[PDB]
Structure formats: structure tokens, C-alpha cells
Design a protein around this nucleic acid. Structure first.
Length: 49
DNA sequence: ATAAAATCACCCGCACAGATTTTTTAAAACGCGCCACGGGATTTTTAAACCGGTATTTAACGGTGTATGAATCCCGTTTTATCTTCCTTTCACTTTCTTTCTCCAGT
């Protein structure tokens, strides 16, 4: 990400064909330990953002 | 008794780096609820396989001239095995305090 601006969204696609959309401004500032962004189930992993 | 050589505590102001100590904030959680979404049972439509044929497009092959992979030699990096140590602990000993038992001079 070059910079955070406007109200663009983030598209997340995992295995088994599950999609999810979230606003970028949520990830504007993060601490040393990050926050939960997706509730994965069983053996599922993010493949594309 | 004359010579050679050493060591430490505190007071007064001021500026700053580092170590606790509250205080605020964002993430995680719980309870309740409702409607968005996916399952199941019909209609509908279209993606790809199949017959042709033609017209290109690729890969295998035969010469030259390099760039690099394995081997060797080192030196900083991190692990692991290996020493010494100060507080916890009791404990037999020693010391020190408290009560008691006589002596004993005086009348």
C-alpha cells in the first residue's frame, strides 16, 4: 500500500471460495500486535488481497 | 621511631536521562434479535464437442562464445557445554539476660 486515503475498500478472497469486503480506513493505524481481520474456519487460508 | 605509597562520607543549584505510576483508549466479549442467504424443486438457454478442411507457428538440430557452479580458504556469529556464586536454611555453640539461693552483718 502506497498510502491510506479516501474510502476505498479491501477485497479478501480465501480458499474454498469465500469472499469478504472491508473498508481500508480500519487498517489505517496498527499497534505492535495486530487485530483480527477475518474469521477463518478449519483449514482455510487467504490467497488473494 | 623514621621512611615509601595510598583511601572515603556530607552540604549547596541546576539541568537532564532513566524508572515507576496513573489515566485514557481501542480491542475482545456477551446477550438478544431479525432478515439475508442458501437449500430444494421446476423452466430455460448456451458452451463446448464434433465433423470437415486450410494456413500458419513451434520445436528439434547444427555452430560459437561466454557467465556460473562447485570447490577451497578463510573470519565474524550463535549454541552449547561447563565453571563459580549468594541467598535460604538449620543447627550446635556461645553469649547474655532474668530469677533464685544462700551468706551474712547488724540489732
Amino acid at each position: 500500500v502506497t498510502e491510506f486515503e479516501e474510502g476505498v475498500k479491501v477485497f479478501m478472497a480465501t480458499a474454498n471460495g469465500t469472499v469478504k469486503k472491508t473498508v481500508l480506513t480500519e487498517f489505517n493505524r496498527l499497534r505492535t500486535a495486530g487485530k483480527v481481520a477475518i474469521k477463518l474456519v478449519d483449514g482455510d487460508e487467504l490467497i488473494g488481497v
